[PDB]
């Protein structure tokens, strides 16, 4: 089984070798990854960063960006996960093919994020905030990345305060999603390693 909803399906033909299983899988997730790149090129100050820092932000943050764009794949009401093929599977299904805590952590995350009832615009700016917030280990111009992040964050606070005037607390909640996204990233990386061992 390959229970990642970036897959077309969690079913893996057992008469297929690792490298060709991965080939088909990579057929499924590579467009979503390429789309992150094109989204990044559209974030206001992103292209002015050095080439190396753009790449290292996208290498480390693509997952967290995708975890935000694909939060709707996790339906809390139905306890189903919609795979990229469009096929739907239940949590119980996925749990017996190997899924566990990371899947549940992700439903929790999607539920909390859909609750904030944001517009597409607020969503696209939050996701730019997410990307430029990526892990900074391979970054060479830290203050420029953090200046871009601080200005996106500020832009986001003005838009959230204007549109959710009954609830400025939505901004803080959004901010507190950044350590959550980082933890899902680390959990998911470990699941990825595990799949290799």
């Amino acid at each position: 089984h390959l229970v990642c909803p970036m897959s077309k399906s969690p079913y893996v033909d057992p008469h297929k070798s690792g490298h060709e299983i991965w080939e088909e899988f990579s057929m499924s997730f590579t467009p979503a990854v390429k789309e992150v790149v094109e989204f990044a090129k559209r974030i206001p100050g992103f292209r002015d960063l050095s080439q190396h820092d753009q790449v290292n932000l996208l290498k480390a943050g693509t997952f967290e960006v995708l975890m935000v764009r694909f939060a709707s794949l996790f339906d809390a009401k139905e306890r189903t996960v919609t795979f990229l093929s469009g096929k739907k599977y239940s949590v119980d299904d996925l749990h017996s093919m190997g899924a566990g805590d990371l899947l549940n952590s992700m439903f929790e995350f999607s539920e909390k994020l859909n609750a904030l009832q944001l517009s597409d615009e607020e969503m696209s700016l939050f996701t730019a905030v997410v990307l430029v917030s990526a892990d900074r280990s391979g970054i060479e111009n830290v203050n420029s990345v953090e200046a871009l992040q601080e200005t996106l964050i500020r832009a986001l606070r003005t838009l959230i305060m204007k549109n959710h005037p009954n609830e400025a607390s939505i901004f803080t909640k959004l901010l507190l999603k950044l350590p959550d996204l980082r933890s899902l990233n680390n959990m998911h990386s470990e699941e990825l390693l595990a799949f290799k061992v």
């Binding site: 790149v37 080439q51 753009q54 790449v55 996208l58 997952f63 998911h188 990825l192």
Partner: peptide, 14 residues
């Protein structure tokens, strides 16, 4: 030490 299956797709665009 991984999750860099995404490198190739990203470094290509630059």
């Amino acid at each position: 030490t991984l999750a860099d299956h995404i490198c190739q797709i990203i470094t290509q665009d630059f």
